[PDB]
Amino acid sequence: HAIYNVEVETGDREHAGTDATITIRITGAKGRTDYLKLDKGSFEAGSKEQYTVQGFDVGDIQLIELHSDGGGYWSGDPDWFVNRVIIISSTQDRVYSFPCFRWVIKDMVLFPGEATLPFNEVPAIVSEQRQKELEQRKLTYQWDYVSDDMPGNIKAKTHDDLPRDVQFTDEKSRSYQESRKAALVNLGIGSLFTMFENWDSYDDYHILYRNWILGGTPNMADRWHEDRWFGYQFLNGANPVILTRCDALPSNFPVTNEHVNASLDRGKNLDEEIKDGHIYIVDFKVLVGAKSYGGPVLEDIGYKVPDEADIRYCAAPLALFYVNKLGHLMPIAIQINQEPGPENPIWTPHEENEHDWMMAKFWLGVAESNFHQLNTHLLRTHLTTESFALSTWRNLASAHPIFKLLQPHIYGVLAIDTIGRKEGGIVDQSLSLGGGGHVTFMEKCFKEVNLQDYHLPNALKKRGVDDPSKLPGFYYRDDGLALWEAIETFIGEIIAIFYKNDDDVKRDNEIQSWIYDVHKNGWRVNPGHQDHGVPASFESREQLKEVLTSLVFTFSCQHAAVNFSQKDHYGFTPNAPAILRHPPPKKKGEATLQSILSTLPSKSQAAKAIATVYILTKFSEDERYLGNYSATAWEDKDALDAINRFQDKLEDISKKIKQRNENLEVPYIYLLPERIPNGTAI
Ligand SMILES: [Ca+2]
Ligand SMILES: [Ca+2]
């Protein structure tokens, strides 16, 4: 016989413990034990428990199987989250270490030692069990679709229908459900306080963030009305993804030197500034044809010739910006809709009537808000990356090194996206496109999505926004690029530990199925779709790196930059309205403060926008931030060294951002590693 010393580490998360009866079967080269009882004492969350069981001597241990009887009549929560099992056999001179970091329901198979690719040499019984795991994953983790024009999501009726490995922790559930209760309370309290106010100035909106715990006053509250800070936010606000270098005006945007000359300040006219690379543009054309709430449909001309019903408007503006001699991005011209003419003219900061320029900025702001929330945030982080999270569960075995790499980063997205698909939520009460056009709009955007868009260096280059001498003070870019490189370096080092060359990439059928599943069933090239840029297979380590870097960066950094920026951005509503209530003007000279206030969001619309931001930006008490791999399943020493390097590099990037920030009038904090969750979980 053999003596086996067995130590089980239980996860610290809530409900991690069990009082199920637990047994363990040990398999090795010589045979296998029966199920042996792990009998005395409790399995509490965070516990490290020791057992000595005796049984057939299996020789060199090859795998183990844990069994839970699923508890008895009184068991509150028999599911048991196991971190690791360590075993010493009295007959083998070594320590077997079995990473888990997954929920044990009834049966769990675990292998000792380092991650392997499916073709690495292992006992046949290990290979058979790997295949059984993958077969089982394909039944639990299934595709489903909002429509032919949306990226694949997880099939699940409600959150509690998700497999436990992909549900929120009980901590995240509490964080989330508690934040909805507080939103409702803060709304009701605020509604009482402001019940009989007549809103008659921009400054009345400050009341609305005042009884909310937001992390501080939105940092644009004192400056939103200055052109300089309006422009700044196209670089450093919630939507830093659409501005591009203008190398020629669009044909439908006929801004002349005479429109903007009073704004230029380096001694050159528009044509020269265009050639000098100091002219930048955003074009919201994708918003043409959008159906806003109450029924208006956006046209190239705006809206046709139409009591207080809830009717909302949006725009498809172009706007032109100029980097002035002090390095500030200045807004210099806005055309509210696509089709130039006397009814859709060009507004500049030199309007005879100052209210007309303000109103033009609000229309540009409403376009941006609906674009940002639906395309930039929801679709391009949450919904699109969700397909890859799902594929990872379907196709990558738990012993696979790239399963182990992705685990900290895919966590959360399935949970929150399933919740969201249930939670007339908001959307609906706080966005002009709420009520159903928001789905059509994301479909519209999805048809253009390409995987190459998720490549940060390439996208910035392509936009022409990557030269700090022509476009200064772009901290999303600077911090983004430093994080991208750190992530890429680390991912490259992981790959090299397990893939020794490109044939290893080609021979790995799991990584091949992983990418193929997204290509075929995830980002489906359907009728009317552009190619989505997802490869059908992998041919090289470098290609494998690029895709994993895109993906990890997007889960963590990109989602953080466009999500957690929302308090500063939307907290003071006039800085970024997401609903407007009247149609654009058809001539100059009509705007007054009063007409402007009746166009801007109402008090409850603005309050419901703040409530949404409060929910979508609440970090949970158990959040893990970028590089914090304390709940990961790695055993390989070289992999742990790579992790060490990555963490020291993030720490260096962190200090550097802090030192940059202390010389900034408005520090840029959303891409600090300690503020970037590993994943998209809210
Ligand atoms: Ca439990
Ligand atoms: Ca004990």
Ligand SMILES: [Ca+2]
């Ligand atoms: Ca370490």
Ligand SMILES: [Cl-]
């Ligand atoms: Cl490993």
Ligand SMILES: [Fe+2]
């Ligand atoms: Fe989010």
